[PDB]
Structure 1
Amino acid sequence: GIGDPVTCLKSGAICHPVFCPRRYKQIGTCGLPGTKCCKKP
């Protein structure tokens, strides 16, 4: 339920501009429309 890039990154997760890479889990957005907060498999 992440909604902003700082919360995403501080957790060790990664911000992608449109979609999470293969095997990554979508956990929220990184604020900017379309962006995704993605965590390791």
Structure 2
Amino acid sequence: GIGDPVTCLKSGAICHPVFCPRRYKQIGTCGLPGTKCCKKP
């Protein structure tokens, strides 16, 4: 899946530390420590 910050932000998603914020679901990582790639369904 997604594991780098460029692809994450180019896929309609955001990078967030630790956990994905409310209304976002985790779809991968952004390659940075403890950072998740997060997207609203």
Q: TM-score, normalised by structure 1?
A: 0.86
After superposition, the CA RMSD in angstroms is 1.0
How far residue 16 of structure 1 moved from its aligned partner, in angstroms, is 0.3
Structure 2 distance, partners of 1:34, 1:12, is 20
Q: TM-score, normalised by structure 2?
A: 0.86
Q: Following TM superposition, where does structure 1 have runs of at least 4 consecutive aligned residues deviating by more than 4 angstroms? A: none
Identity rate, percent: 100
Q: Which runs of 5+ in 2 are unaligned?
A: none
